[PDB]
RNA sequence: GAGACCGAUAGCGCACAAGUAGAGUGAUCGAAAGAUGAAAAGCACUUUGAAAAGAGGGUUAAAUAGCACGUGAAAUUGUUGA
RNA sequence: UGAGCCCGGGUCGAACGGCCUCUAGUGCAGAUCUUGGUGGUAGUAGCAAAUACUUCAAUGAGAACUUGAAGGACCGAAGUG
RNA sequence: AAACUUUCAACAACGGAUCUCUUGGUUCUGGCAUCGAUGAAGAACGCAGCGAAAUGCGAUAAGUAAUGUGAAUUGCAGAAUUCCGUGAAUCAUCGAAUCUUUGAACG
C-alpha cells in the first residue's frame, strides 16, 4: 500500500502522466526484460530498449519471431523488429508495432554508457542480497 | 388608443415591436384570457 | 556546416570574428543560390543559422566574463550585470542592515543569553 | 464612425470625439475595471495572454533566485 | 481606400494568411484531430 | 458551484407573446440567443436546491 | 534604397544606376535594381545568382 | 448492406447511389413505375419520360397535380414527367447492367426485382 | 493529495485551435461541438461512370466498424410480407 | 391483482447482478415547460417591373441564360460612358 | 383485383437516445510566499524545409549557451552516430544570453 504523501493513486493523473510523458521518461517506460542467459551474466533483470538490441517476441500474433530492433518509436510506445512486417494493399511492407513488454532481449547492444547502466543496477541488487542474506 | 395585437401569424413569438404598429401597443394570447377571467372573478367577488 | 560549442570556447576574439564573418558570408551566398533547387542545401542553411547563433552566444559570453572581472572590485555595476532577483527582493534591506542591532540590545544578549536547561520528571 | 482602433487594447472602442477608449480608457494610466461585471474582468485578466516574464518567475524561486554558473562547467 | 498605411497593409496581409486552408500533411500526424480550417 | 447557471444575462420576454414565460438569453448572433435560462427545467440552467 | 545599393556593391560586387522599391501586399519589399550599361544582368544572374 | 437480403449476390447484379440531389417524392414515384420490369423495357420507358412520350403516374405524392391522357395506360389521371429523376435512374440501371456484364449474366433476361428510394439528410 | 460528487442537454460558458466562431457603434453578449480499429492493416488491382461514386476483389476477429466511422431507441420514411 | 420480474430468439462487445442495511440531484403526458430531432399542410403558395429576343459554328459529358459572327432592339454626353 | 389510407412484422433509411468509456469539471485538505522603470499584466507583428489555428520563441526567432541522461526525431523529404562518445533528442533540468512595435510607457 502507498505510504509516502507525494505518491498518488489517482487513475486520472496516472493516465495523464503516461500519455503526456516526455521522451526521456518514455525511454524508461519502454523497457524490456533480459534473457535468462543475460540475467545470470549481468545480475540485471530489465533495461530500457534501444535501437541496436536483438529481441525475441514472446507475446502477440508473432509467436517466437526473432530479429534486431530497427526503430524505437517513442511517440506511440512501440518498437520495430526487423522482418516483422505486414504488407499494405499496394504490397509495400510496413513494420508492425511491438510493445517492449512483449519481447525479451537476447543480445544487448554494448557501449560504455550501457555498461555503466548494467553496473549500477547490479550494484543495488547485490547490496540488498547481502543485506537480506546477512 | 392602445393597439391590441394578437400574437398569431407573423406576430407569434416576437421579441419586440410588431411591424405594422405605430404607438403604444399591447400583445395578447389565449393564456392571458384565463388570467383576465381570474382577476375579474376575484374583484367581482370582493366587490 | 555545424560548429561545435566546445571548439569555440578555446578560440579567442579575433578568431571568433573571422568564423562569424565566414559563416555569414557563406549563408549570404547560399541563400541567394538556394531560391532555386531547394534540397540538401536547405538543412545546410539551417545548420549555418544555428552556427551563427552559437558563435554569437560565445562572443557575448566571453565579453561579459571580461566585464565582470573588470567590475569585480567596483562600487557600481551595469544593470545588465547586476543580479535580477525580483523588484521587491532588490528593495529589501541588506543582510548586514537587517541584522544590525542596537548596542544596548547587544549588551543584554552578551551577558544574558538563552541557556540550555531541562526539568526532571 | 463613432469608434476607432485603440492602441492599448486592440479593440475598435476608442471614441473619435472624446478620445477615450470605451473598454480600457487608454489615456488614463489605469485600466478600466468594474466589479459589477465579473465576465469582463476575466476576459482581460492575467493569464489570458502570453505571460512572457511572469511564467519564468516560479522556476527561479524554486532554486532560490541563485546567481552564478554550475561548478566545473565550460 | 487607395490611401492607406504600411502597418494596416501588414494587418490586411495577416488576415489573408489566416484564411489559408489546412495542409494535407497536418492531417496525417499521429494524434491529430484537425480536419477543416475554422 | 454557487455560480452554475447564474453567469448569464436573461430576461423574460413578457406575457403577450405566445411563448413560455421563462428568462431568455439576449443577444442575437449565437445559438444561445433567445434560449431559456435560470430554470431547473432548462438546459444549462441552475439545478433545483443546489447542493451546499 | 541607399542600404540596398551599398549591400549589392559590397557583397555581390554589383553596380546599380538606380533602385526602385515597392512593398508587396504580404508585407515583403521588392527592389528593382537597374544595372550599369557596362555590366550584363544575364551574365550576373547566371553566375552569382544561379538563375536562368 | 442493401435491404433485400434474401437475394444471393452471386446470381444478381446491384447498383447504389447516396445523397443524390434530386426530389425524393418525384424519384419515389418513378422508381415505383419501373418496379418489377425488365431492364430494357425500363430503359426505354425512362428515355421516353425525358422526351415526354410516356408519363410517370403519381400515386402517393400527387397533391394538386395536372391530368394527362398519357396516364390512361396506368389507370390514373395524374401523371407527370420527372426528367431529373429519370436521368438518375438511368445511370444506376446502366451501372447495374455493367456489373451484370462483368459477372457474366444475361442482360436480356434481367428484371428489376428490388428498387428502393430512401431519404437522405436534408440540405 | 483526496471524494458514498458530475459523467458530454450532466459537470465551470469552455473534457475539442472557448471567452473561440458569431452579434452589437459601444459598454457588453456569447454558443455548438468527445468515442473507427489492438494495429491504418484507411481497400492494391479489374470493371462501369465526365465525375461524384457503384460493382467485383481485398485488410480485419468484425466493413452487421469505410473516417457521414463504438453501441445505434423513438418520432418520421422506403421496399417486401399479411 | 398491479407497478413490475424472469426466460427464449436477433444485434453487440466489456463489464454487471441477486440478498440485507446505508445514502439521494431517485420514478412525468401535460407546466402557451427547456434542448434536439421529425411530420401533415405540399411537390402546394410561389419563383415580381425594368418592351426582346432569334440563326449558324466552337468549347464541353451536359449549353435558353459560355464564347465568335450575323440579325432585331436599347442607354442617347442631366448615359445603361 | 389493383391503386390509395391504416395496423403489424423483417430489412433499409432519418435522427442521435441508451449502455460503456474519460489527459475534463466540481468540492475538501495539506506544504509554501514568488509581478513591475534591470520595463510588468495586456495588445501587435514576425520566426519552421513543407503550417492556417493552438503552442513555443523574438531578426541568435517551433530557438542559443550550460548541466544531466544516454541513441533518437518521425506525417514526408534531407542530414546523423562511427556506438567504445563532450554526444542524437519536438528529451529533461536550468544558475548564462538574445529578447522587434506598443503598453505604468518615458525625446
Ligand atoms: Zn482600449
mmCIF file of N, CA and C in Angstrom, chain C residues 14-82:
data_model
loop_
_atom_site.group_PDB
_atom_site.id
_atom_site.type_symbol
_atom_site.label_atom_id
_atom_site.label_comp_id
_atom_site.label_asym_id
_atom_site.label_seq_id
_atom_site.Cartn_x
_atom_site.Cartn_y
_atom_site.Cartn_z
ATOM 1 N N UNK C 14 39.621 37.464 -31.909
ATOM 2 C CA UNK C 14 39.933 37.689 -33.317
ATOM 3 C C UNK C 14 39.544 36.489 -34.170
ATOM 4 N N UNK C 15 39.813 35.278 -33.679
ATOM 5 C CA UNK C 15 39.429 34.080 -34.417
ATOM 6 C C UNK C 15 37.914 33.947 -34.502
ATOM 7 N N UNK C 16 37.206 34.303 -33.427
ATOM 8 C CA UNK C 16 35.753 34.176 -33.422
ATOM 9 C C UNK C 16 35.110 35.101 -34.447
ATOM 10 N N UNK C 17 35.637 36.317 -34.592
ATOM 11 C CA UNK C 17 35.104 37.239 -35.589
ATOM 12 C C UNK C 17 35.319 36.712 -37.002
ATOM 13 N N UNK C 18 36.474 36.093 -37.257
ATOM 14 C CA UNK C 18 36.722 35.501 -38.567
ATOM 15 C C UNK C 18 35.738 34.376 -38.861
ATOM 16 N N UNK C 19 35.444 33.543 -37.860
ATOM 17 C CA UNK C 19 34.476 32.466 -38.045
ATOM 18 C C UNK C 19 33.081 33.034 -38.259
ATOM 19 N N UNK C 20 32.710 34.048 -37.475
ATOM 20 C CA UNK C 20 31.398 34.665 -37.636
ATOM 21 C C UNK C 20 31.259 35.308 -39.008
ATOM 22 N N UNK C 21 32.321 35.960 -39.486
ATOM 23 C CA UNK C 21 32.267 36.574 -40.801
ATOM 24 C C UNK C 21 32.124 35.558 -41.916
ATOM 25 N N UNK C 22 32.862 34.449 -41.821
ATOM 26 C CA UNK C 22 32.818 33.453 -42.886
ATOM 27 C C UNK C 22 31.517 32.661 -42.853
ATOM 28 N N UNK C 23 30.912 32.510 -41.672
ATOM 29 C CA UNK C 23 29.598 31.881 -41.597
ATOM 30 C C UNK C 23 28.533 32.752 -42.253
ATOM 31 N N UNK C 24 28.578 34.061 -42.003
ATOM 32 C CA UNK C 24 27.590 34.959 -42.592
ATOM 33 C C UNK C 24 27.776 35.077 -44.098
ATOM 34 N N UNK C 25 29.027 35.154 -44.559
ATOM 35 C CA UNK C 25 29.282 35.197 -45.995
ATOM 36 C C UNK C 25 28.824 33.914 -46.672
ATOM 37 N N UNK C 26 29.062 32.766 -46.033
ATOM 38 C CA UNK C 26 28.580 31.503 -46.579
ATOM 39 C C UNK C 26 27.059 31.472 -46.638
ATOM 40 N N UNK C 27 26.397 31.956 -45.585
ATOM 41 C CA UNK C 27 24.938 31.964 -45.569
ATOM 42 C C UNK C 27 24.378 32.914 -46.620
ATOM 43 N N UNK C 28 25.017 34.072 -46.798
ATOM 44 C CA UNK C 28 24.541 35.033 -47.788
ATOM 45 C C UNK C 28 24.640 34.464 -49.197
ATOM 46 N N UNK C 29 25.765 33.821 -49.517
ATOM 47 C CA UNK C 29 25.913 33.217 -50.837
ATOM 48 C C UNK C 29 24.971 32.033 -51.014
ATOM 49 N N UNK C 30 24.800 31.225 -49.966
ATOM 50 C CA UNK C 30 23.938 30.052 -50.069
ATOM 51 C C UNK C 30 22.479 30.443 -50.268
ATOM 52 N N UNK C 31 22.016 31.472 -49.554
ATOM 53 C CA UNK C 31 20.600 31.831 -49.594
ATOM 54 C C UNK C 31 20.172 32.266 -50.990
ATOM 55 N N UNK C 32 20.994 33.082 -51.654
ATOM 56 C CA UNK C 32 20.653 33.563 -52.990
ATOM 57 C C UNK C 32 20.644 32.426 -54.004
ATOM 58 N N UNK C 33 21.574 31.484 -53.895
ATOM 59 C CA UNK C 33 21.582 30.306 -54.752
ATOM 60 C C UNK C 33 20.642 29.212 -54.258
ATOM 61 N N UNK C 34 19.984 29.412 -53.113
ATOM 62 C CA UNK C 34 19.014 28.454 -52.596
ATOM 63 C C UNK C 34 17.615 28.669 -53.157
ATOM 64 N N UNK C 35 17.317 29.868 -53.661
ATOM 65 C CA UNK C 35 15.983 30.210 -54.145
ATOM 66 C C UNK C 35 15.589 29.271 -55.279
ATOM 67 N N UNK C 36 16.582 28.683 -55.940
ATOM 68 C CA UNK C 36 16.363 27.683 -56.974
ATOM 69 C C UNK C 36 16.934 26.347 -56.518
ATOM 70 N N UNK C 37 16.176 25.276 -56.761
ATOM 71 C CA UNK C 37 16.593 23.907 -56.459
ATOM 72 C C UNK C 37 16.859 23.719 -54.962
ATOM 73 N N UNK C 38 15.807 23.918 -54.172
ATOM 74 C CA UNK C 38 15.883 23.636 -52.747
ATOM 75 C C UNK C 38 16.042 22.136 -52.512
ATOM 76 N N UNK C 39 16.725 21.791 -51.424
ATOM 77 C CA UNK C 39 17.052 20.402 -51.160
ATOM 78 C C UNK C 39 18.027 20.219 -50.016
ATOM 79 N N UNK C 40 19.103 19.467 -50.263
ATOM 80 C CA UNK C 40 20.117 19.253 -49.234
ATOM 81 C C UNK C 40 20.812 20.549 -48.842
ATOM 82 N N UNK C 41 20.664 21.603 -49.646
ATOM 83 C CA UNK C 41 21.212 22.896 -49.258
ATOM 84 C C UNK C 41 20.335 23.591 -48.225
ATOM 85 N N UNK C 42 19.098 23.121 -48.042
ATOM 86 C CA UNK C 42 18.213 23.732 -47.056
ATOM 87 C C UNK C 42 18.713 23.485 -45.639
ATOM 88 N N UNK C 43 19.027 22.229 -45.311
ATOM 89 C CA UNK C 43 19.467 21.927 -43.954
ATOM 90 C C UNK C 43 20.871 22.455 -43.691
ATOM 91 N N UNK C 44 21.691 22.583 -44.737
ATOM 92 C CA UNK C 44 22.976 23.253 -44.580
ATOM 93 C C UNK C 44 22.784 24.710 -44.184
ATOM 94 N N UNK C 45 21.812 25.385 -44.800
ATOM 95 C CA UNK C 45 21.495 26.756 -44.416
ATOM 96 C C UNK C 45 20.966 26.799 -42.989
ATOM 97 N N UNK C 46 20.118 25.835 -42.626
ATOM 98 C CA UNK C 46 19.643 25.746 -41.250
ATOM 99 C C UNK C 46 20.791 25.493 -40.282
ATOM 100 N N UNK C 47 21.713 24.598 -40.646
ATOM 101 C CA UNK C 47 22.875 24.354 -39.798
ATOM 102 C C UNK C 47 23.762 25.587 -39.719
ATOM 103 N N UNK C 48 23.828 26.361 -40.803
ATOM 104 C CA UNK C 48 24.569 27.618 -40.772
ATOM 105 C C UNK C 48 23.953 28.596 -39.782
ATOM 106 N N UNK C 49 22.620 28.689 -39.762
ATOM 107 C CA UNK C 49 21.955 29.633 -38.869
ATOM 108 C C UNK C 49 22.216 29.298 -37.407
ATOM 109 N N UNK C 50 22.157 28.014 -37.051
ATOM 110 C CA UNK C 50 22.446 27.622 -35.677
ATOM 111 C C UNK C 50 23.912 27.853 -35.340
ATOM 112 N N UNK C 51 24.794 27.725 -36.334
ATOM 113 C CA UNK C 51 26.201 28.038 -36.117
ATOM 114 C C UNK C 51 26.398 29.519 -35.823
ATOM 115 N N UNK C 52 25.685 30.387 -36.546
ATOM 116 C CA UNK C 52 25.780 31.822 -36.292
ATOM 117 C C UNK C 52 25.291 32.146 -34.887
ATOM 118 N N UNK C 53 24.190 31.521 -34.470
ATOM 119 C CA UNK C 53 23.692 31.724 -33.115
ATOM 120 C C UNK C 53 24.697 31.243 -32.079
ATOM 121 N N UNK C 54 25.373 30.126 -32.356
ATOM 122 C CA UNK C 54 26.347 29.592 -31.409
ATOM 123 C C UNK C 54 27.527 30.539 -31.233
ATOM 124 N N UNK C 55 28.052 31.069 -32.340
ATOM 125 C CA UNK C 55 29.202 31.961 -32.256
ATOM 126 C C UNK C 55 28.820 33.261 -31.562
ATOM 127 N N UNK C 56 27.610 33.758 -31.824
ATOM 128 C CA UNK C 56 27.155 34.982 -31.172
ATOM 129 C C UNK C 56 27.048 34.797 -29.664
ATOM 130 N N UNK C 57 26.589 33.623 -29.222
ATOM 131 C CA UNK C 57 26.493 33.358 -27.792
ATOM 132 C C UNK C 57 27.868 33.338 -27.135
ATOM 133 N N UNK C 58 28.851 32.716 -27.789
ATOM 134 C CA UNK C 58 30.185 32.605 -27.204
ATOM 135 C C UNK C 58 30.863 33.967 -27.154
ATOM 136 N N UNK C 59 30.679 34.778 -28.196
ATOM 137 C CA UNK C 59 31.270 36.114 -28.216
ATOM 138 C C UNK C 59 30.708 36.957 -27.079
ATOM 139 N N UNK C 60 29.388 36.910 -26.894
ATOM 140 C CA UNK C 60 28.763 37.654 -25.807
ATOM 141 C C UNK C 60 29.193 37.118 -24.448
ATOM 142 N N UNK C 61 29.300 35.794 -24.318
ATOM 143 C CA UNK C 61 29.659 35.204 -23.034
ATOM 144 C C UNK C 61 31.071 35.595 -22.614
ATOM 145 N N UNK C 62 32.019 35.565 -23.550
ATOM 146 C CA UNK C 62 33.391 35.939 -23.223
ATOM 147 C C UNK C 62 33.491 37.417 -22.869
ATOM 148 N N UNK C 63 32.758 38.267 -23.591
ATOM 149 C CA UNK C 63 32.807 39.700 -23.322
ATOM 150 C C UNK C 63 32.251 40.022 -21.942
ATOM 151 N N UNK C 64 31.188 39.328 -21.536
ATOM 152 C CA UNK C 64 30.614 39.562 -20.215
ATOM 153 C C UNK C 64 31.530 39.043 -19.114
ATOM 154 N N UNK C 65 32.266 37.963 -19.384
ATOM 155 C CA UNK C 65 33.230 37.466 -18.410
ATOM 156 C C UNK C 65 34.345 38.476 -18.177
ATOM 157 N N UNK C 66 34.818 39.120 -19.246
ATOM 158 C CA UNK C 66 35.836 40.153 -19.098
ATOM 159 C C UNK C 66 35.307 41.340 -18.305
ATOM 160 N N UNK C 67 34.060 41.738 -18.561
ATOM 161 C CA UNK C 67 33.487 42.881 -17.857
ATOM 162 C C UNK C 67 33.299 42.584 -16.376
ATOM 163 N N UNK C 68 32.849 41.372 -16.045
ATOM 164 C CA UNK C 68 32.667 41.010 -14.643
ATOM 165 C C UNK C 68 33.992 41.021 -13.895
ATOM 166 N N UNK C 69 35.070 40.601 -14.558
ATOM 167 C CA UNK C 69 36.395 40.724 -13.962
ATOM 168 C C UNK C 69 36.768 42.188 -13.769
ATOM 169 N N UNK C 70 36.412 43.039 -14.733
ATOM 170 C CA UNK C 70 36.718 44.461 -14.628
ATOM 171 C C UNK C 70 35.951 45.116 -13.485
ATOM 172 N N UNK C 71 34.671 44.779 -13.333
ATOM 173 C CA UNK C 71 33.825 45.358 -12.299
ATOM 174 C C UNK C 71 33.833 44.548 -11.009
ATOM 175 N N UNK C 72 34.866 43.733 -10.791
ATOM 176 C CA UNK C 72 34.892 42.869 -9.615
ATOM 177 C C UNK C 72 35.002 43.678 -8.328
ATOM 178 N N UNK C 73 35.816 44.731 -8.335
ATOM 179 C CA UNK C 73 36.062 45.499 -7.121
ATOM 180 C C UNK C 73 35.627 46.947 -7.291
ATOM 181 N N UNK C 74 34.449 47.160 -7.868
ATOM 182 C CA UNK C 74 33.925 48.496 -8.096
ATOM 183 C C UNK C 74 32.545 48.614 -7.469
ATOM 184 N N UNK C 75 32.220 49.828 -7.024
ATOM 185 C CA UNK C 75 31.004 50.036 -6.246
ATOM 186 C C UNK C 75 29.756 49.831 -7.095
ATOM 187 N N UNK C 76 29.736 50.390 -8.298
ATOM 188 C CA UNK C 76 28.581 50.308 -9.178
ATOM 189 C C UNK C 76 28.879 49.431 -10.384
ATOM 190 N N UNK C 77 27.864 48.688 -10.810
ATOM 191 C CA UNK C 77 27.921 47.749 -11.913
ATOM 192 C C UNK C 77 26.817 48.068 -12.908
ATOM 193 N N UNK C 78 27.003 47.716 -14.177
ATOM 194 C CA UNK C 78 25.915 47.877 -15.148
ATOM 195 C C UNK C 78 24.704 47.047 -14.757
ATOM 196 N N UNK C 79 23.519 47.568 -15.086
ATOM 197 C CA UNK C 79 22.285 46.870 -14.739
ATOM 198 C C UNK C 79 22.199 45.513 -15.421
ATOM 199 N N UNK C 80 22.843 45.361 -16.580
ATOM 200 C CA UNK C 80 22.858 44.068 -17.254
ATOM 201 C C UNK C 80 23.604 43.024 -16.432
ATOM 202 N N UNK C 81 24.691 43.421 -15.775
ATOM 203 C CA UNK C 81 25.481 42.504 -14.967
ATOM 204 C C UNK C 81 25.030 42.438 -13.515
ATOM 205 N N UNK C 82 24.098 43.290 -13.103
ATOM 206 C CA UNK C 82 23.573 43.218 -11.751
ATOM 207 C C UNK C 82 22.637 42.019 -11.612
#
